[PDB]
Amino acid sequence: VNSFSGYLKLTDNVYIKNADIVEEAKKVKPTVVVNAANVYLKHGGGVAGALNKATNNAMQVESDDYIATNGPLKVGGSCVLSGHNLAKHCLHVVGPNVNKGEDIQLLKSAYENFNQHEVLLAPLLSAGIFGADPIHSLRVCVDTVRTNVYLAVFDKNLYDKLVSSFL
């Protein structure tokens, strides 16, 4: 038993809710919240900008030190940093950005990072401003992640489309 509430169960291990991931993180305080990161951990907009704003820019300060030490992430890669006031940990995961021409096949590699964590609160990778089809992202999620994932979809219209079209 865990504290996630109001989710629709899609599969054995994948759950979905129309929710603001920032507000969901603030209430649940999950062990892991996933950020829709880029390779530079520049949290300017989308999910990343919202998560970072909710940390009062502490996420960005920590991220800048991480990059100064380690260099950029790989597309499809991840790193574990603090969850600040939102979660114990933040798993920064880089899905491919279609608006930059990155290979969509890397979306499966991106979701594989979730398997290193027993339970996660997450957005749909490569959705939103990353330009992928969220229905495809949900399919890859279901077919790749084996650990327990609670997906938060900000847009109610999109949420209904994702549920109604789910196979």
Ligand SMILES: O=C(O)[C@@H]1CCCN(C(=O)c2ccnc3[nH]ccc23)C1
């Ligand atoms: O989900 C939607 O409707 C939008 C379009 C797809 C990408 N988005 C998210 O992944 C998301 C989900 C939940 N809270 C969020 N806060 C900021 C982004 C965000 C936003």
